Amino acid sequence: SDIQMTQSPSSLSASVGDRVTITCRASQSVYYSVAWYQQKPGKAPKLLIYSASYLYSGVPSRFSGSRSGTDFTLTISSLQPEDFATYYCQQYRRRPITFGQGTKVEIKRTVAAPSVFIFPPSDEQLKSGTASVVCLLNNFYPREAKVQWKVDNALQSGNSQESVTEQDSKDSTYSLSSTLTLSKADYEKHKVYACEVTHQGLSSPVTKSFNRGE
Amino acid sequence: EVQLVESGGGLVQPGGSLRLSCAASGFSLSSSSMHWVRQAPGKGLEWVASISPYSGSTSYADSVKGRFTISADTSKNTAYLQMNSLRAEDTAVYYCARTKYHYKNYYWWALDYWGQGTLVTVSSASTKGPSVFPLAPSSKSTSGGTAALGCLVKDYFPEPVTVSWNSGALTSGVHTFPAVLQSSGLYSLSSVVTVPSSSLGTQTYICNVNHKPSNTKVDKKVEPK
RNA sequence: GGCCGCUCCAGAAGAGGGCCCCCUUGCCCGUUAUCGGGGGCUAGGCUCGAUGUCGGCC
């Protein structure tokens, strides 16, 4: 029975000057053997808090931790721009040491609908036996968006993958790319290729589509 | 003044071996406990092994016991992680980290300094350059007076690929998405750009795709219907 | 039966021990190492002991 650390929320949005609280629950008691780490993309973690509430040297005083039972809390009293990052809790009550899944703190900004764009597979790719149909969702916020692929009005499943950029450094939005991948044989079977996007910034879903050939 | 520098990460097939190194400066290994913690792509953090160089003591996560070996050399102020019988699920960024020894604390506390990490990829996949296909700007997929076009960088291995547009002259409004690992073991990714629709006749848009592991360089021009 | 003993057998047998909770290690302690006290639970599973329903000798 490893001790499990469960962090919530998975992510949260906030603005400079806000007070931010992240929580982490241990599957059983760990007394006060908890630490908190900050990690930014493609960078190493940095220790913030140890023994659940002790400030590590060089950690600014806006960082603080506390404990209530098996619940542990990381508080940033006044979020500064360099604090947007992922935060992990960790117990070292008992080996193996274990980590929470991490909480991402993202920049708050106003809702923005995505510009949707659909791309049929190139003729070049079709002769090599595969069809990739790409749907672009450009410059939107918040992160949560759903792309539904429809072929001759048939809801697709399991034949698409998604990739999302980090928050843009200038305007803090996201952009997402979904690729629908088909055997050329299955591609020739059907005519209408549709991408249906739903998002908080769209009052009704936006469908972009084409017909094979026409 | 403290630095941890990891080396020895790389590409290798299942059943193979790698030896990581963690060069430490600014402190003495005998005054610390040293750890390896791994981060799989997109995932969190998971502990691998720990060593106290002063005493020789070591410990392991149950999923590497008997395959990995942690060791330290105080004459080089460095720690190591020998990794045998690698499986795909060992693919991750491997960080080493120090816990400082405090003769009043009666036990080892947090991981207070982490290195930059070294990448370990375990895959059967063959090194291969990408195929670049145009994502054609549409006559019926305009947004405003704004058009989106791009190029799909497909079926390459391993990471990474670099993409620029018009040899770097065009950077504004470019999104190059994170690669996705397909079930075949190859990576694919698209890079896109938004552009004035009125510029679709006069401006030429070319994506410059470079893949160092395969010495593969492609310049693909993207054009309307 | 007497004497001796616990290697085998029993669980009929105590103590260590174990798990959980509180106390930021809090009498004294602490392997480059996670305790101590308080509380709740735990018996035949390990060590050590005891015993017979055991064994050895005469």
Short mmCIF file of C-alpha atoms (C1' of nucleotides) in Angstrom, two decimals, chain B residues 30 52 55 102 107-108, chain C residues 25-26 30 32-34:
data_model
loop_
_atom_site.label_atom_id
_atom_site.label_comp_id
_atom_site.label_asym_id
_atom_site.label_seq_id
_atom_site.Cartn_x
_atom_site.Cartn_y
_atom_site.Cartn_z
CA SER B 30 28.84 12.79 0.95
CA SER B 52 23.23 7.99 0.26
CA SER B 55 26.87 5.19 3.73
CA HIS B 102 21.26 17.82 8.12
CA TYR B 107 15.82 11.68 8.42
CA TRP B 108 15.87 12.61 4.75
"C1'" U C 25 10.19 14.68 16.61
"C1'" G C 26 7.14 17.02 21.83
"C1'" G C 30 17.25 8.70 16.42
"C1'" U C 32 23.89 10.18 6.01
"C1'" A C 33 18.58 7.60 9.99
"C1'" U C 34 12.07 8.99 10.69
#
